[PDB]
Each structure stands twice: as C-alpha cells, then as structure tokens.
Amino acid sequence: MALYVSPIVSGEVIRSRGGSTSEFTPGYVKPKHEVNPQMTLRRLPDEDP
Amino acid sequence: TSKETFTHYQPQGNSDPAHTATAPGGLSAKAPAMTPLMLDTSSRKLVAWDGTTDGAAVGILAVAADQTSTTLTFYKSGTFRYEDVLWPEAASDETKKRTAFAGTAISIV
Amino acid sequence: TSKETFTHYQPQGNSDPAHTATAPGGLSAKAPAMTPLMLDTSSRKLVAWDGTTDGAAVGILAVAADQTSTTLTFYKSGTFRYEDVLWPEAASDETKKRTAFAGTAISIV
Amino acid sequence: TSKETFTHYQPQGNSDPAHTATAPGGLSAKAPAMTPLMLDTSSRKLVAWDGTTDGAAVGILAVAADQTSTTLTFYKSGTFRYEDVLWPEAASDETKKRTAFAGTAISIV
Amino acid sequence: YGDVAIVVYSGQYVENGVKKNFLPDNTMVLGNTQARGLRTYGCIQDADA
Amino acid sequence: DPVEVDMGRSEENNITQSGGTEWSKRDKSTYDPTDDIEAYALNASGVV
Amino acid sequence: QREGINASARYPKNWVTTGDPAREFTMIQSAPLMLLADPDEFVSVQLA
Amino acid sequence: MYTTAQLLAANEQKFKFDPLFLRLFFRESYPFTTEKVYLSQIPGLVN
C-alpha cells in the first residue's frame, strides 16, 4: 500500500521484490520383462487347437 | 463350466545370471525343484534344508531327485521369486524366510 | 525439492547517507558484517556489543574482521533495517533493540 | 581460495559385474550408499555393519534409506574400491576390513 | 435489468502484507453512470518541481 | 530413494469442504451452489 | 550414450544373455517429470 | 562446481486489480493551482 507520508519529513525505502527458485531434478522408470523361451512350447489361450 | 487358467512359469525374478553346480547329496526323501539345501554337520553331505537351522542355506535345487541320487545339481546364484520356490513349513515368519540366502549369490525377490 | 529464496541485499532503509569510519578494534572472535559495536571500558578498544549495557552502542560494523584485525571500519551515520542487523542474543527485547542506537546518528527502521 | 577437486565417481574396481538384491531392512540410523550390512542376530533383519563382528558382512547398500524403508536394496557381487567404501568407525584395522567380505561375491580391491 | 445494469465488483487492494477487498461484504450502490466525478490533483510540493 | 516435489501450491487452493455445511448437510431444493464456486474461484490467479 | 540419444522421450532396448542358459529381454527407459509452471492456477476442492 | 542447471519458464503473479471507479464516475480530471477547494451547489427551488 502507498503510505500517506507528509511531504515535509521523508519517505521510506520500499524493499524491492523478486527471487524464488527450486529444483525438481531426477526422475526415472524402467519396466523390464523376460521372454523365458520355455513358455512357447505350450499353446496360448488364442490360436485355436 | 470348468476353467483351466494358462499361467506362465518364471522362477527367476531378475535378469542376473543363474549359474549351477553339482555336489554329492544325502537326501532322505523326494525333493522337487526349488527345494533349499543345507550342508550336513556330520559328513558334510548335502541334504534338504530343515527350515530351522538359521544361516544353513547353501543352494536351491534345480532338478528333481530322490534319495537314490548320488549327485545333486543346484543353483548357486541369481534371483528367485518367493511365490515360485518351495520352502519348508518349519520356517513360519516371512522376515527370516527372506534373508535366509544372504551371504550367498542367491537372492529372493 | 529444496527451495532457495533470492532477496535483494538492502541494508539501508532510508535515503540517509551511510558514512564510514575507522577505529582500533579489540574483537575476540569472528564477527560478520552488520554487527553492533561498543567501547571497551578499560582499554577503549572496539568490541562486539554485549546486548545488555544501555547506550553502549556506538556504531555498526561495516567490513568483516577478526581478533587479529587492529583496525575496524564501521558505519557511524544512517538508517538500517531491523532484520539485516545481526543483533546479539542477549538483547532479547524488540523495543530496546529498536532504540539501542538512539542518541547517535545510527537509526533503526 | 576454495578448490574444486573433481574425481570421477567409479565405485567398481574391476570388470566383474555388480549384481543387486532386495531384502527387508531394519536400520537404526540413517545410512548413505556404500554402507556394509549384516543380518540381525535375533530377527535376522538387515542392519548396518558394526565393524567388529567378524564375518558379518553380507553386502553393500546400493541406495540411501532410513527407518521408514521396509526393504533395502544392496549389492551382492563385484569388487569395490577400498577408499570409496564408507567403513564404520569401529573398524580400525585396514587388513581386517580388506578381507571382511571374504567368502562372499563382494570383494575389495 | 431493464433501465439498470448489474455490475459485480470484486477488486482487491493490498495492505502492508495481506490482500483485502475494496467493498464491504454486503453492500450495493445506486447511482448514474453519467454522474460527474472529479479526479483532482494537488500541487507537487517538491523542491525540484 | 524418496524424491519430494513442492510445486509451490499455497494452502488457499486446497479447500476442504469438511465441517457441518459442506454440501450434503444442505437442502437440495433451496441452496444454490454457484456462490461456493465463485468464492472458491476467487483465489485462482487467472481465468478458469 | 553410444548412439547419442541421451535426450529422448522413450528408449526401447532388446538384448540377449550369453552362456548355455540363453534368455532375451526387453526394456523401455525414460524419465517422466510432469511439472506445472503456476501451481496456484488451479483450485482443488475436496467435496463431502 | 559441476551443477549443470537448466532454467525453464517463470511465473507472473499480478493482481486482480481493475478500478471500475476511475473509469465509470471519475472520468474528468483537474489539477490545482490553489490550496483549498470549494464545492458549491445552488439549491434550485422556485416558488
């Protein structure tokens, strides 16, 4: 707010604004899967007999 | 009516290599695949893990065999799932069941 | 994750000129900038303000110094912000701190 | 003024791959990475290495954790540099620490 | 609303550190949009002025 | 290891209806919910 | 890093392990890090 | 030392401040040359 100081004495120095930072760095994901070559011997639920 | 679910069969839990080895065995009864083994304290002949002697795990059996088998082939590395490996009912608390293979290349996920 | 607030470094709070001065000092420990100073009662060297003696404040230190610093540069006039002065822990009253420099050219806004 | 000594972060000391594992954790204090572990003498949970129990080392912690972590992830194979391992303060003998992981796939080079 | 327009004003002014509303909670004003208002400005009491 | 992100949300934009007057303890036919909407959207800092 | 694909949305990878036990694998690597410039732009009202 | 920080977009945060009063009723502006100001109004009531 702009103060109502009288125009005789002085005016206060309003502190300047600005400045705020933060970091959100790493992140990751890796969903590994296998193949297990021994499951292909049996039949899938599809692929009618 | 009846349902027969076709589920896959993956004993490994990680991509780490699963080596194997052979050693003389002293089994007393039929032991299916993935039955933990312990080393006997009298003659040091491999037997099935009792589930009570803590820290006695030495390996996991890979091929089915009975008391007639002179040599047993067991894994000595890799990572295995809890739900796939057959552990004896003597060990009842899950925490001690998990860390039974610590100190050896075999791990449980 | 972590937060770093950037604020402009404005020790002054009014357009009053900030005049510096030099004097012998008798500090005994590390004293950062914006530290009040007082006169020694015996040797009249400059020391860190204890925060208990009324009217002992004579100025605010302008440049960092140590016990080996034979000369200290301190402010002797102007207006300074309350939050920027490193008040001693003994002066635990806000009113006394705001009027500690009264009677001199130093003022606190 | 202040130096910026930069060393490449290479924990491994040989071409031997470093295999990992997971097991329930019971840490009593904050443990950074490269912290040796043993099993609890009673509950067989994973705790930090004291540096005085001979042969208790079973692995090296892989990720940072605290009391809120139920399950720890730790290395179970490979070789590590002696200087990079955050040894416990109690273990004062270099020779004992260098062979503390003998009998396990972990090695110190 | 016929001869009258309805205007909702929720402007905010900033106090020393906080945000507040210009108008009180439950009020209305009845006036003319052509009513004469003055934006009078005083003399600049500055030495350079 | 846990990684926590403080995007910077203030507490004025996390209104919780909990109390004795949220919406379910009101009359279905007489109450108008638009006032709650305009009150909650007051501290939005931009068009919604 | 050997193909210079350090800055990418996703990264598929297929490989096979040597030795007499042979196993293939498949992986997708990425780093999704959803962010909002102005957290105060939205108001999350939890009804009751 | 080795930081490698990249800065993304920033924020704005201005007020919700529109007069509606310096634009609807106070459209006319005057300066001063005097100290005081009168505001006379004649009561128009014929007989």
DSSP string computed for G6-48: -S-SEEEEEEE--SSS--EEEEEEE------S-GGG----B--
**Amino acid (one-letter) located at B6:** F
Q: Report residue C49 as tokens.
A: 């303000």
Judging by DSSP bridges, how do beta strands A20-22 and C3-5 pair with one another?
antiparallel
Please name the fold of domain C19-108: Virus Head Decoration Protein; Chain: A, (2.40.300)
Q: Are G40 and F8 in contact (CB under 8 A)?
A: yes
- Taking Cα atoms as reference points, which of C105, C93, C95, C83 lies closest to residue C34? C83
- Taking Cα atoms as reference points, which of D21, D28, D19, D11 lies closest to residue D65? D28
* HSE-up of residue B54 (Cα within 13 Å, Cβ side): 14
Q: Report residue C53 as tokens.
A: 């003696």
Q: Alpha-carbon distance D90 to D92, whole Å?
A: 6
Kindly list the distances between the CA atom of residue E5 and the CA atoms of C90, D86, E22, F5, in Å, as whole numbers in the listed order: 64, 76, 20, 47
Give how far B72 is from chain D: nearest CA, Å: 22
- 3-class secondary structure, C94: helix
Count of residues in chain E: 49
- For the CA atoms of F6, F11, F15, F19, the dihedral, rounded to the nearest 10 degrees, stands at 120
Chain B: residue whose CA lies nearest to A39: B8
- Taking Cα atoms as reference points, which of D64, D35, D50, D65 lies closest to residue D96? D50
Residue D72 in contact with partner chain B when CB distance is under 8 A: no
Alpha carbon B66 to its chain centroid, in Å, reads: 14
Q: Which 8-state DSSP code applies to residue A44?
A: P
Judging by DSSP bridges, how do beta strands D20-24 and D71-75 pair with one another?
antiparallel
Alpha helices in F1-48 (DSSP H): 34-40
Q: Are D91 and D36 in contact (CB under 8 A)?
A: no
- Taking Cα atoms as reference points, which of H17, A32, B73, E39 lies closest to residue G11? A32
3-state SS of B69-105?
CCEEEEECCEEECCCCCCCCCCCCCHHHHHHHHCCCC
Closest in B54, B55, B109 to D22, CB measured: B109
- Name the interface residues of A facing F (CB cutoff 8 Å): 22, 24, 26
Q: Report residue F34 as tokens.
A: 């638009």
**Angle at Cα E24 formed by Cα E18 and Cα E27, nearest 5°?**
160
Q: What are phi and psi of B97, to 5 degrees?
A: -65, -40
Q: Report residue H19 as tokens.
A: 């007069």
Q: Alpha-carbon distance D59 to D101, whole Å?
A: 8
How would DSSP label each residue in C41-88? SSS--EEE--S-STT-EEEEE-S-B-TT-SEEEEE-SEEE-TTTS---
Question: Which of chain F's residues have a Cβ under 8 Å away from the Cβ of A26?
Answer: 3
Kindly list the distances between the CA atom of residue B33 and the CA atoms of A41, B81, B88, in Å, as whole numbers in the listed order: 20, 13, 13
- 3-class secondary structure, F23: coil
| Segment holding D98, helix H or strand E | helix D94-98
Residue D7 in contact with partner chain H when CB distance is under 8 A: no
Q: Which 8-state DSSP code applies to residue F13?
A: G
Resolution of the structure, angstroms? 3.8
Q: Are C17 and C78 in contact (CB under 8 A)?
A: yes
- 3-class secondary structure, B13: coil
Put simply, the answer to whether B17 touches G25 (Cβ < 8 Å) is: no
Domain boundaries, given as residue ranges, for chain C:
19-108
Put simply, the answer to whether A1 touches E14 (Cβ < 8 Å) is: yes
Q: What are phi and psi of D98, to 5 degrees?
A: -65, -30
Q: What are phi and psi of B48, to 5 degrees?
A: -70, 140
CB pairs below 8 Å between D and F: how many?
3
Q: Are C39 and C54 in contact (CB under 8 A)?
A: no
Q: Alpha-carbon distance H21 to E29, whole Å?
A: 12
Q: Are A38 and C17 in contact (CB under 8 A)?
A: no
Q: Alpha-carbon distance C13 to H9, whole Å?
A: 33
Give how far G16 is from chain B: nearest CA, Å: 10
Judging by DSSP bridges, how do beta strands C57-61 and D20-24 pair with one another?
unpaired
**Amino acid (one-letter) located at C35:** T
Q: How was this structure determined?
A: cryo-EM
CATH of domain B20-108: 2.40.300.10
Non-local CB neighbours of C53 within 8 Å, separated by 6+ positions = C38
Tokens 């139920």 locate to D70
* b (16+ CB within 10 A) / e for B75-99: bbbbbbeeeebebeeebeeeebbbb
Judging by DSSP bridges, how do beta strands C71-75 and D36-39 pair with one another?
unpaired
Q: What are phi and psi of G20, to 5 degrees?
A: -65, -30
Residue F13 in contact with partner chain G when CB distance is under 8 A: yes
Question: Which of chain C's residues have a Cβ under 8 Å away from the Cβ of A9?
Answer: none
Q: What is the largest CA-CA distance in chain B?
A: 55
Q: Are D108 and D84 in contact (CB under 8 A)?
A: no
- Taking Cα atoms as reference points, which of D21, D4, D107, D12 lies closest to residue D63? D21
CA dihedral sign, ordered E28, E30, E31, E37: negative
Count of residues in chain C: 109
Non-local CB neighbours of G35 within 8 Å, separated by 6+ positions = A24, F7, H8
Q: Alpha-carbon distance A22 to C31, whole Å?
A: 31
